[PDB]
Amino acid sequence: EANYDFLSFMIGAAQRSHRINRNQALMIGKGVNEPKGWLTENCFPVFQTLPVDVNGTSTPAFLAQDWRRFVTSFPAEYGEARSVMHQNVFGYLAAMVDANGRFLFGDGDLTFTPDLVRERIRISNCLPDPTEGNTKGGTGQDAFAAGSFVAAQAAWKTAFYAVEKRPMFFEQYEGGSSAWCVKYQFGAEDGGFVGCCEHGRILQI
């Protein structure tokens, strides 16, 4: 009974739960029982911006001049590299302003929407964002949390490897299942590691 097909819902809500756990692991997974992610291993060279003196207080900051110097510094001898970041950060860059009030990008369009795949940015809004979701960062004072993460960049095809051994599988668990109740069992086997971690880089505050 139960007109709504429940089994196909769980088989759907297991590949989904697995998909985001795997994506979450390869980033910040900690050693034992989950692959060592490249955010926590922290052997990518890391660059950090220096603060600015808003009326003599030295709040942390991150302005467009920092982004251009961070992405062009990548030695082109490693190959072509893509940058990943949280979409609020890209919103942060797009809303900057020069001293007179103009926008630094799209000098009057109500919107800055550039070709991302022609800029190698690959927004994925699960990463950590320094805007604390939103409603933090980019202040005169009382925001922006020194020491935070902003974005990354690497020749990913060789700076981090993903290992797959056996894809997701489902099977009726004969035993523990009787003539009136079924017990299903699913599983998959995979892992990941860093390649050579002189191919990447990280930007901080």
Partner: protein
């Protein structure tokens, strides 16, 4: 074996602020005075 199930009768709103980068300052200007 009871398994409860609870909903709220009146959901609440949720406000938030929209801080945006300040008009920048630049660290160190060349022509200046001590």
């Amino acid at each position: 074996m009871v398994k409860l199930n609870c909903r709220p009768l009146c959901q609440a709103p949720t406000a938030s602020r929209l801080v945006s980068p300040p008009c920048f300052i630049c660290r160190g200007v060349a022509p200046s005075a001590p």
